[PDB]
Amino acid sequence: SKRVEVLLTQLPAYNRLKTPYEAELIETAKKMTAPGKGLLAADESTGSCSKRFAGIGLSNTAEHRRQYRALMLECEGFEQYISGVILHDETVYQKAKTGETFPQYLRRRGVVPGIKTDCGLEPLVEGAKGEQMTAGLDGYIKRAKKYYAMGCRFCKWRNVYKIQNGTVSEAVVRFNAETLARYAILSQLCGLVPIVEPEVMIDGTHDIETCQRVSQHVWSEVVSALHRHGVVWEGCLLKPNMVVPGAESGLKGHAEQVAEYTVKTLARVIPPALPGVTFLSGGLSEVMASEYLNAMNNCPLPRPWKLTFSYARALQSSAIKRWGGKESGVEAGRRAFMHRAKMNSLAQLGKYNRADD
Amino acid sequence: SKRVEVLLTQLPAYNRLKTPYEAELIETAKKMTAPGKGLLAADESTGSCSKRFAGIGLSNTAEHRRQYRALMLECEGFEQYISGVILHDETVYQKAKTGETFPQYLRRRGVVPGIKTDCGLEPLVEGAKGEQMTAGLDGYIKRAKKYYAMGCRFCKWRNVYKIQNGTVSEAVVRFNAETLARYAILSQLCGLVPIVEPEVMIDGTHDIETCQRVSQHVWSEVVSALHRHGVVWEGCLLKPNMVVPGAESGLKGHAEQVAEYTVKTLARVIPPALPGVTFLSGGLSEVMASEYLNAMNNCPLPRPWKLTFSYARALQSSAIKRWGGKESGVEAGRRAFMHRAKMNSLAQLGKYNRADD
Amino acid sequence: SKRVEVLLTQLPAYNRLKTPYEAELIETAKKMTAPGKGLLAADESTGSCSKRFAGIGLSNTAEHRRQYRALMLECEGFEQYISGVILHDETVYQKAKTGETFPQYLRRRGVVPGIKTDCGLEPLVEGAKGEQMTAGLDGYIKRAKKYYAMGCRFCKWRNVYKIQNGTVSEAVVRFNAETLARYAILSQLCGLVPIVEPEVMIDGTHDIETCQRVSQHVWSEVVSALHRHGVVWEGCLLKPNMVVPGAESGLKGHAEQVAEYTVKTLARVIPPALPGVTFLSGGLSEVMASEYLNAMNNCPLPRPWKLTFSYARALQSSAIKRWGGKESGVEAGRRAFMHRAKMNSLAQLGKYNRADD
Amino acid sequence: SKRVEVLLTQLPAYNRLKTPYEAELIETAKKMTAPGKGLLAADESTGSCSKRFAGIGLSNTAEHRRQYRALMLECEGFEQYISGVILHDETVYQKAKTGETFPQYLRRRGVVPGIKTDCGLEPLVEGAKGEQMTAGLDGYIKRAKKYYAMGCRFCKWRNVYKIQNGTVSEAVVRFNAETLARYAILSQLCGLVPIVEPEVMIDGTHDIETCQRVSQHVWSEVVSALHRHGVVWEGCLLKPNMVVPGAESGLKGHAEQVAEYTVKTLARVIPPALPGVTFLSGGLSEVMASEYLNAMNNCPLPRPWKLTFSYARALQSSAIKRWGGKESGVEAGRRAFMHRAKMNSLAQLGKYNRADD
C-alpha cells in the first residue's frame, strides 16, 4: 500500500506529555504524600477571605490576609504534619517574618509551596442552570512558569459538579473533564505537579447512593480525559470529594460507610500509578473530616495510592476563631491549628482517635 | 422502576443553546451572505499590519492603521459588494471620517460590522511539533457583549491545522474542533453570529488528495462538536479553506478541479441548514481567489448553502500597493479595491470573467 | 524527531471504505430515488405476516406469503411508481409467475431488488427497560455477498429508539448509531446500497417537540458514526421517521407542521451529499402518509436530497383488504395498491391532491 | 424550568449492569485468582488442534481431542495449581473418565470450568490491512446461558491488535474496545465472569518501547469502554499480553525489564478494583513464560490486582511432546504438565527458580 513517513507524535498512541521536569514532578508528589502528612489549602480568594474574617470582625486588607496566612504558615512545628501548602497568588509574593517570600520560607522549612492556578467558576452555559465551568487556561503557561520560578512546585485547579435532581448534565461531565485534563498537561509541562480537583459537591438533598453514582461517572470521565491528553500519571494527584450524603439530605453517614463508598468508588476508576488522593473536606465538620479520613486508612478495600487530606476550613476553622484577628489570639490560634493538623496527620496513618478530639 | 424528576436540560438531547438573539442571528447571517456580496476581512493584528505596510514603507502607527482601514471602509460604493467587514478590536473604537465609530459608520451604510474575537495561535503542546491551538475563551462573554454593544453583530475565530507528512495529529483535530464549537456557542449567546474558521493550511508539499482527506476529517469533527455543544446552525457560518494542492507541492489546480474537490468535501459534512460558507483565500493569488470562487458557483455538485468569500489579502493586495500609504495614492488604491471587490461579487454569482482581470 | 513510515490507512483521516462497487452503488441509489418513485417495503417476517393476514383469514404458509408478495410485485404497471422493493430473505428465493426468481423478475422489469439484512430487535441490556438493539452483524459479509449474487443491489437494516418519559438513554443513542454505521460500511463493501433506518418510534404520549429533540440527537449521532466508520455518503440512503406527535399523545399535526419540523430537523444533520431520504410511515394512516410526504416536497426549507417513501403498511393495507387472500380479490387488491402507489408517486413530486383520496 | 420524570436508567451515570449473579461473579473471580493458582487455557479450535497434533502425528478426531484434553484435565493433582480451565465448546459436552461431563468433573474436583465464547477473528475492514475484529455477539446471551447451565462459571473472548509500522489504526483500537466491553457486560448478565483479552500481538519487528506505547493506548481504551458499558469491575478479569519486544525484532528482554514495563503499563490504566490479570504467553517459550511471570510478582511497582497466568502452549508444549498421542506417553505427558504447572504456580507466588527448570 501507500505508506508515508510521519512523526510518531502524529500517531494516536504517541500523544504523551514529554516534560523535562518529569522526575522532579514524581519526587514532589511523593514528598506531598509522605506518610502522616497532608496539605493545608490556604488559597482563599480575597473575597473568600471576607467570609473567613467575618465572624472575628477582622477587616479585609492585604496585611490582614498576610497575617491570617502567617498564623498558620509561621506556626513552627506545623511542618511535621503538613507536606505542602496551596497558596493564593497574592501570598506567593508576600513575605514571611524572616523577610523570605512565603514560598522561600516554606521550602527552607521543608514544605512544598503550591499555587491555586485556576481563574474561578463561571456559568457553564451548556447543560443545566446552576452548573459551572472553570476558567483560567488562557495565559496559563506563562503564569505557571512564573510560579515555578517563584519556587512553587505544585498547583491546584478546581472544577465542580452540582447534583440537582439526582443527576448532573452529561455536558458538565464532559466539559469539566476536558478542562481538568488540559490543565494537568500544561501544569506538568511547566514543572508543577497538578492537583486535579473534580468536586462533586455536597450541596443538595441527594443521598450517598446518588453521590456515589455521580462521582463514579464524573471521575471516570476525568480519567479517560487525562489519558486522552497524555498526562504523566506518576507526576499527578487527585483531590476528590468523599462520597457522602448531600448536605440537605437529612442523613449523616458513619465514617466506615463513607470510607467504603469512597474507596470502592475510587478503586473502580483511578489508576494505581497515581501516587495519591488529597481529599477535600467541603461541608464536613472539622471532626468528621478527620474521622472520615481515618476510616479510609483503615478500609480493607483496595487502595493503592496514598489517601490523605488537602483541607482548608476543616484545618482552620477553630484556629481562626481562637486567633480572633489579634496578635493576642495568636498562640491560641496556633494551638488549635496544630491540634487539627495533628489529628489529621494521625488520620492519614489510620491512627486517629476521636477520644482525642 | 426508580424514576426521578429532572430538568430537561439535564438530558443529552436537550443541550441546545437557547439565545434570545436567535432571530437576529439568523437575519444577520442571511444579510452576510446576500447574493453578489461577501466579507472583507480587515482584522489584521498590529503586527500583521507591519507586514502589510512593509512593502510601501508605511510606518506602523494607530493612525496609519486607521488610514489603511479607511482606505477600504470609506471607499463609498464598496457597500454593493461587501456585506460585512471583520474588524480588528482597535478599529472598532476608531472613528470614521464622519466622526461615527467605524461600526456606526458601516451599519449606517448598510454593512454589517463584525469582530475578530480569538486571542491568537499558540503551541498545541499535545500532538506534533508545529501544530497550534487558539486562545481566547477566557473572558469571552464579556468581550463579546461589549462588541455587540458597540454595534458588531458577527464575530470570527480562526483555528489552523498544519498538514505535515501527509497528515495531522488526531489531538489537533479534536482539540481545535472542541475550541471552535465552544466559541460558537458562546458567540451566539452574546448576539454575534459566529464565523467558524477551521483552516487546513495550504502550507507544505502535500497535494490536493491529501488536502481533501484532511479537510474532510477535520471539518466533520468540527461539525460533530458543534452538534455536541448545542449550536444554532441557522445562526452560524463557516470559513474553511478551499481544497487545493499545498503551496510547496509544485502543482497548481484548475479552478474546476478545486471547486469539485471543495464542494464535494463540504457536501459530505456540512449540514444544509448552515446558511453560508465564506471562504478564506490564504496563499492564493488575488486572481485565483476569484476564479476559484467563481467555479464553486458554477459547480454541479450539491451546494445548498451560499458559497461566498471572506478575503483579506486577496481583496487588498493591489490596493495597498496602489495606495502607497499616501493620500495621494488614495484614489488609485480604491479603484483597485473596487475592482477586486467587484470581481469577487461576480464570482459569488458565478459570473466572473477572467478576461475582465 | 523520530519519524516512521506507516500505511496511510493506519491514519485517522484515512479510514474510508474503499469499495470497487462504488460507482454502481451511486448509480443504484440515484435509480432508487428517481423522481415520482419510491420504495415498497415488503420485508415482513413470517410472523409479521401472521399479523398481516389476520384480518383476512389467510393461513400463514410459504405459498400464501409468495402470493401476498406476488399480489404487488406482479402488479404490472406498479413499476412506474416503485423504484425498488425491500424483500424478505424468503422472497429472494421464491419464483415469480414467469419462473424467474423475484429478484430476476423485478430487475427485468426495471425495479431494483433489495433485502432486509438485519436479524431483528433484541433487548439493549444497557440503558433503560424497553430499549432495543438490533442483531445481525455476524456473518454479514457472507450473507450480503450472497444476496448480491442473487441480484439484490441494496439492503435495509432497522434500529429503533423508544421515547419514554420524554427521552431516550444516551446508551441506546450511541450503541444503535455505532451498529448502523458498521452495517453501512459492510453493506457497501459487498455491493449493496445501505438504507440506514434509525427509527425514533411514534409510540408513546410524547409530543412533536419531544420527537424533534430526540430525533435530531439520534440522527446526528448516526451521522457522526457514519463518518467515523468511513461510509461513501453518495452510495448510502436514509430511512428516518417523520417528526410527528406520539401515537398516544392525543394530538395530530398538520402536514405542513410535519414537513417543517421534519425537514428542518434533517437539514440540521444530514450531509447534502447523501442522495435521498425514504421515509418510513410507521403508525401513520395510508392518507396521512401521502399527505405528509407531499408537504415535505412542498417545504421551503432546505432539502437537498430526494425526499421520498419507503412504505409497507401504508402502501398495502387497503390492498390486502380488498385482495382477501383470494384469487378472486386479486384485481381489486391491485387496484388499490396502484392507487396508493400513484398517490405516493405524486406526493414525491409534491403534487399529490387529497381530493383524489 | 421544564422538568420531567424519567427512569434513572435513562441517565448517563446510571448505565450500570445490574446482574443477580453479582456476588457469584465476584466469588468466582477470587477463586480463579487464588494465590499459587492460574488458568489452563485449553480452548483450541478444531483447527488449532491440527496444528497441535502435528508434530506427534496424532490424527485429528473428536476422540483424540477428548484425549488430548483428558491428558491434562484428568491429571489428578493438577488441581493444586490450576484454578480454572478455559474449555472449547466441544469439550464442554464431552465426558470425563468418570462419565461426568468435563465441566461436572472439574467442578467436583475444585476447578472452575470456563468457556471460550467468541466466534473467531475476522478482517476489520475498517483501518489497515492485517487488522482483525472478533465475531460472536449475535446469539450471545443464549449461548452463555446455556454454558452457565452446563456448569461454566467464566468465559473468555479474545481480540487482537497487530502492530505494523510501529503503530495500529485508531479504528482497530476503538472498535475492538467497544466489542470487548459489550461482551463483558453480556457475560456478566448471564452469570459468567468475563476474561477480557485485548492482545497486542508479539508479532513483528517492533521493540519493547513500541509495545508499551501501543499497549498502554489499547488498554486504556478498553477500560474507558468498560466504564462506558457499565461493567462490574469486581466480577471481571483481564488477559493482556506482557510488554515485550516483537518476535522478529531481534531482541530479547530480561524478565525484570519485562515486569517493569508490563506492570508500569498496567498500573497506568487498570482500576485496582479489577481482581486479577491472567497473562497470555503467546510466542514466549515455556521457560520465559514462567520467568516473566515470576518477575512480575516480584516487581516493586504498584500492582494491586493478582498477577497470574492463563497459558495454553506454554503449559502444554512439552507435555504434548512427551505424551505422543499415546496411552503409553500418558504418564510422561503428565509429568511434564505437572512440572510446568508447578513452575507457574510458584511464579504466581513470586518464588519460581529457574535452576528448577
Coordinates of N, CA and C in Angstrom, one line a residue, chain C residues 46-152:
Chain C
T46 N -41.9 -13.6 8.7 CA -43.0 -14.7 8.8 C -44.0 -14.4 9.8
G47 N -43.6 -14.0 10.9 CA -44.5 -13.6 11.9 C -45.3 -12.3 11.7
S48 N -44.5 -11.4 11.1 CA -45.3 -10.2 10.8 C -46.4 -10.5 9.9
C49 N -46.1 -11.5 9.0 CA -47.1 -12.0 8.0 C -48.4 -12.5 8.7
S50 N -48.2 -13.1 9.9 CA -49.4 -13.6 10.6 C -50.4 -12.5 10.9
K51 N -49.7 -11.5 11.3 CA -50.5 -10.3 11.6 C -51.2 -9.7 10.5
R52 N -50.4 -9.6 9.4 CA -50.9 -9.1 8.1 C -52.1 -9.8 7.7
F53 N -52.1 -11.1 7.9 CA -53.2 -12.0 7.3 C -54.4 -12.1 8.1
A54 N -54.2 -11.6 9.3 CA -55.1 -11.9 10.3 C -56.4 -11.4 10.0
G55 N -56.4 -10.1 9.6 CA -57.8 -9.9 9.4 C -58.4 -10.5 8.2
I56 N -57.8 -11.2 7.3 CA -58.5 -11.7 6.0 C -58.6 -13.2 6.2
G57 N -58.1 -13.7 7.3 CA -58.2 -15.1 7.5 C -57.3 -15.9 6.6
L58 N -56.2 -15.3 6.2 CA -55.4 -16.1 5.3 C -54.4 -16.8 6.1
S59 N -54.2 -18.1 5.9 CA -53.4 -19.0 6.7 C -52.0 -18.6 6.4
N60 N -51.1 -18.9 7.4 CA -49.7 -18.4 7.2 C -48.7 -19.4 6.7
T61 N -48.7 -19.6 5.3 CA -47.8 -20.6 4.7 C -46.8 -19.9 3.7
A62 N -45.7 -20.6 3.4 CA -44.8 -20.0 2.4 C -45.5 -19.7 1.1
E63 N -46.4 -20.5 0.7 CA -47.1 -20.3 -0.5 C -48.0 -19.1 -0.5
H64 N -48.7 -18.9 0.6 CA -49.5 -17.7 0.8 C -48.7 -16.3 0.9
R65 N -47.5 -16.5 1.5 CA -46.6 -15.4 1.6 C -46.2 -14.9 0.2
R66 N -45.8 -16.0 -0.6 CA -45.5 -15.8 -2.0 C -46.5 -15.1 -2.7
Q67 N -47.8 -15.6 -2.5 CA -48.9 -14.9 -3.1 C -49.2 -13.5 -2.7
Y68 N -49.0 -13.3 -1.4 CA -49.2 -12.0 -0.8 C -48.1 -11.1 -1.5
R69 N -46.9 -11.6 -1.7 CA -45.9 -10.7 -2.4 C -46.2 -10.5 -3.9
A70 N -46.6 -11.6 -4.5 CA -46.9 -11.5 -5.9 C -48.0 -10.6 -6.2
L71 N -48.9 -10.5 -5.2 CA -50.0 -9.6 -5.4 C -49.5 -8.2 -5.9
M72 N -48.4 -7.8 -5.2 CA -47.9 -6.5 -5.5 C -46.8 -6.5 -6.6
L73 N -45.9 -7.4 -6.4 CA -44.8 -7.5 -7.3 C -45.2 -7.8 -8.7
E74 N -46.2 -8.6 -8.9 CA -46.6 -8.9 -10.3 C -47.8 -8.0 -10.7
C75 N -48.0 -6.9 -10.0 CA -49.0 -5.9 -10.3 C -48.3 -5.0 -11.4
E76 N -48.5 -5.5 -12.7 CA -47.8 -4.9 -13.8 C -48.2 -3.5 -13.9
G77 N -47.2 -2.6 -14.0 CA -47.6 -1.2 -14.1 C -47.1 -0.6 -12.8
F78 N -46.9 -1.4 -11.7 CA -46.5 -0.7 -10.5 C -45.1 -0.1 -10.6
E79 N -44.4 -0.7 -11.6 CA -43.1 -0.2 -11.9 C -43.0 1.3 -12.2
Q80 N -44.0 1.9 -12.5 CA -43.9 3.3 -12.8 C -43.7 4.0 -11.5
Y81 N -44.2 3.4 -10.4 CA -44.1 4.3 -9.2 C -43.2 3.7 -8.1
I82 N -42.8 2.5 -8.3 CA -41.9 2.0 -7.3 C -40.6 1.7 -7.9
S83 N -39.5 2.3 -7.4 CA -38.2 2.1 -8.0 C -37.4 0.9 -7.5
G84 N -37.8 0.4 -6.3 CA -37.1 -0.7 -5.7 C -38.0 -1.5 -4.6
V85 N -37.8 -2.8 -4.3 CA -38.6 -3.4 -3.3 C -37.7 -3.9 -2.3
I86 N -38.0 -3.7 -1.0 CA -37.2 -4.3 0.0 C -37.8 -5.7 0.3
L87 N -37.1 -6.8 -0.1 CA -37.6 -8.1 0.0 C -37.2 -8.6 1.4
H88 N -37.9 -9.7 1.8 CA -37.6 -10.5 2.9 C -36.8 -11.7 2.3
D89 N -35.9 -12.3 3.1 CA -35.0 -13.3 2.6 C -35.6 -14.5 1.9
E90 N -36.8 -14.8 2.5 CA -37.6 -15.9 1.9 C -38.0 -15.6 0.4
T91 N -38.5 -14.4 0.2 CA -38.9 -13.9 -1.2 C -37.8 -13.9 -2.2
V92 N -36.6 -13.6 -1.7 CA -35.5 -13.6 -2.7 C -35.4 -14.9 -3.5
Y93 N -35.6 -16.0 -2.8 CA -35.5 -17.3 -3.4 C -36.9 -17.7 -4.0
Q94 N -38.0 -17.1 -3.8 CA -39.2 -17.6 -4.4 C -39.3 -17.2 -5.9
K95 N -40.2 -17.8 -6.6 CA -40.3 -17.6 -8.0 C -41.5 -16.8 -8.4
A96 N -41.2 -15.9 -9.4 CA -42.3 -15.1 -9.9 C -43.1 -16.0 -10.9
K97 N -44.2 -15.5 -11.4 CA -45.0 -16.3 -12.2 C -44.3 -16.7 -13.5
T98 N -43.4 -15.9 -13.9 CA -42.6 -16.3 -15.1 C -41.7 -17.4 -14.7
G99 N -41.6 -17.8 -13.5 CA -40.5 -18.8 -13.3 C -39.1 -18.1 -13.0
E100 N -38.9 -16.8 -13.1 CA -37.6 -16.1 -12.7 C -37.7 -16.0 -11.3
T101 N -36.6 -15.9 -10.6 CA -36.8 -15.6 -9.1 C -37.3 -14.2 -9.1
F102 N -37.8 -13.9 -7.9 CA -38.3 -12.5 -7.8 C -37.3 -11.4 -8.1
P103 N -36.1 -11.6 -7.5 CA -35.1 -10.5 -7.8 C -34.9 -10.4 -9.4
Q104 N -34.9 -11.6 -10.1 CA -34.7 -11.6 -11.5 C -35.8 -11.0 -12.2
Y105 N -37.0 -11.3 -11.8 CA -38.2 -10.7 -12.4 C -38.2 -9.2 -12.2
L106 N -37.9 -8.7 -11.0 CA -38.0 -7.3 -10.8 C -37.0 -6.5 -11.6
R107 N -35.7 -7.1 -11.6 CA -34.7 -6.4 -12.3 C -35.1 -6.2 -13.8
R108 N -35.5 -7.3 -14.4 CA -36.0 -7.3 -15.8 C -37.1 -6.3 -15.9
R109 N -38.0 -6.2 -14.9 CA -38.9 -5.2 -15.1 C -38.4 -3.9 -14.6
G110 N -37.1 -3.6 -14.4 CA -36.9 -2.2 -14.1 C -37.0 -1.8 -12.6
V111 N -36.9 -2.9 -11.7 CA -37.2 -2.4 -10.3 C -36.0 -3.0 -9.6
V112 N -35.4 -2.1 -8.8 CA -34.2 -2.7 -8.1 C -34.6 -3.5 -6.9
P113 N -34.2 -4.7 -6.8 CA -34.5 -5.6 -5.7 C -33.5 -5.4 -4.5
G114 N -34.0 -5.2 -3.3 CA -33.1 -5.0 -2.2 C -33.5 -6.1 -1.2
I115 N -32.9 -6.1 0.0 CA -33.1 -7.2 1.0 C -32.9 -6.7 2.4
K116 N -33.8 -7.1 3.2 CA -33.7 -6.7 4.6 C -32.6 -7.6 5.3
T117 N -31.4 -7.0 5.7 CA -30.4 -7.9 6.2 C -30.2 -7.8 7.7
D118 N -31.0 -7.1 8.5 CA -30.7 -7.2 9.9 C -31.3 -8.4 10.4
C119 N -30.9 -8.9 11.7 CA -31.5 -10.0 12.3 C -32.5 -9.7 13.3
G120 N -33.1 -8.6 13.4 CA -34.2 -8.4 14.3 C -33.8 -7.7 15.6
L121 N -34.8 -7.2 16.4 CA -34.6 -6.4 17.6 C -34.3 -7.2 18.8
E122 N -33.5 -6.8 19.6 CA -33.3 -7.6 20.9 C -33.1 -6.5 22.0
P123 N -33.2 -6.9 23.3 CA -33.1 -6.0 24.4 C -31.8 -5.3 24.5
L124 N -31.7 -4.0 24.7 CA -30.4 -3.5 24.7 C -29.5 -3.9 25.8
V125 N -30.2 -4.3 26.9 CA -29.4 -4.6 28.1 C -28.8 -3.4 28.8
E126 N -28.0 -2.7 28.1 CA -27.6 -1.4 28.7 C -28.8 -0.4 28.6
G127 N -28.7 0.7 29.2 CA -29.7 1.8 29.1 C -31.0 1.4 29.9
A128 N -32.2 1.8 29.4 CA -33.4 1.6 30.1 C -34.3 0.5 29.6
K129 N -35.2 0.0 30.5 CA -36.1 -1.1 30.1 C -36.9 -0.6 28.9
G130 N -37.1 -1.5 27.9 CA -37.9 -1.1 26.7 C -37.0 -0.8 25.6
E131 N -35.8 -0.4 25.8 CA -34.9 0.0 24.7 C -34.4 -1.3 24.0
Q132 N -34.0 -1.2 22.8 CA -33.6 -2.4 21.9 C -32.5 -2.1 20.9
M133 N -31.6 -3.1 20.8 CA -30.6 -3.0 19.8 C -31.1 -4.0 18.7
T134 N -30.2 -4.0 17.6 CA -30.6 -4.8 16.5 C -29.4 -5.8 16.3
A135 N -29.7 -7.1 16.1 CA -28.7 -8.1 15.8 C -28.4 -8.2 14.3
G136 N -27.3 -8.9 13.9 CA -27.2 -9.4 12.6 C -25.8 -9.1 12.0
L137 N -24.9 -8.5 12.7 CA -23.6 -8.3 12.1 C -22.8 -9.5 11.9
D138 N -22.9 -10.5 12.7 CA -22.2 -11.7 12.5 C -22.6 -12.5 11.2
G139 N -21.6 -12.8 10.4 CA -21.8 -13.5 9.1 C -22.3 -12.6 8.1
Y140 N -22.3 -11.3 8.4 CA -22.9 -10.4 7.5 C -22.3 -10.4 6.1
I141 N -21.0 -10.3 5.9 CA -20.5 -10.2 4.6 C -20.8 -11.4 3.7
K142 N -20.8 -12.5 4.3 CA -21.2 -13.7 3.5 C -22.7 -13.7 3.1
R143 N -23.5 -13.2 4.0 CA -24.9 -13.1 3.5 C -25.1 -12.1 2.4
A144 N -24.5 -11.0 2.7 CA -24.7 -9.8 1.7 C -24.1 -10.2 0.3
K145 N -22.9 -10.9 0.3 CA -22.4 -11.3 -1.0 C -23.3 -12.3 -1.7
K146 N -24.0 -13.1 -0.8 CA -24.9 -14.0 -1.4 C -26.2 -13.3 -1.9
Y147 N -26.7 -12.3 -1.2 CA -27.8 -11.5 -1.8 C -27.4 -10.8 -3.1
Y148 N -26.2 -10.2 -3.1 CA -25.7 -9.5 -4.3 C -25.8 -10.5 -5.4
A149 N -25.2 -11.6 -5.1 CA -25.1 -12.6 -6.2 C -26.5 -13.1 -6.6
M150 N -27.5 -12.9 -5.8 CA -28.8 -13.2 -6.2 C -29.4 -12.1 -7.0
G151 N -28.7 -11.0 -7.1 CA -29.3 -9.9 -7.8 C -29.8 -8.7 -7.0
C152 N -29.6 -8.8 -5.7 CA -30.1 -7.6 -4.9 C -29.0 -6.5 -5.1

